Design a protein around this ligand. Structure first.
Ligand code: A1B1O
Ligand code: ZN
Length: 139
């Protein structure tokens, strides 16, 4: 579980969005596993605006923050889960690291701010949904 809170926006994994998020929907992309909903209070997370490939992610299944190298956002074939069939997930970055379903929403951060959230995993890899291209989160 987990979310990014920036301005009057809440960024969550689409497969973990609640009743309240869908009713106050701003934007959603199934292929990215992202959903943004409006909020009444202002958030304090800063979104990174960079092309960093090193950062630190939070892994709740280990209660630990791990430093990782990650690939640039791409279109990657992801195996079927209970939430989506087997498909090409877009704007996805991979790192060698531990992750379990319940780790989705864990933040990946660089020196410039929030890079993305845990969205996929398996075979000793963790996948993060990039949010650095969503420039409208800043305004
Ligand atoms: C099921 C599930 C989770 N993905 C749901 C979202 C999704 C499905 O396809 C593309 N995205 C998952 N996230 N992590 C970090 C895992 C690690 C190991 C095994 C599964 C997972
Ligand atoms: Zn950065």
């Amino acid at each position: 579980s987990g979310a990014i809170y920036v301005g009057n926006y809440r960024v969550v994994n689409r497969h973990l969005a609640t009743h309240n998020d869908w009713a106050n929907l701003v934007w959603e992309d199934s292929s990215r596993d992202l959903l943004v909903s409006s909020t009444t209070a202002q958030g304090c997370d800063t979104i990174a605006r960079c092309d960093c490939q090193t950062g630190v992610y939070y892994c709740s299944s280990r209660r630990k923050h791990y430093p990782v190298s990650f690939s640039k956002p791409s279109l990657i074939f992801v195996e079927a889960s209970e939430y989506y069939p087997a498909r090409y997930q877009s704007h996805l970055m991979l790192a060698v690291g531990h992750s379990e379903p319940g780790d989705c929403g864990g933040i990946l951060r660089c020196q410039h701010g929030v890079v993305g959230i845990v969205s996929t995993g398996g075979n000793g890899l963790v996948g993060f949904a990039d949010v650095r291209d969503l420039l409208w989160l800043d305004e």
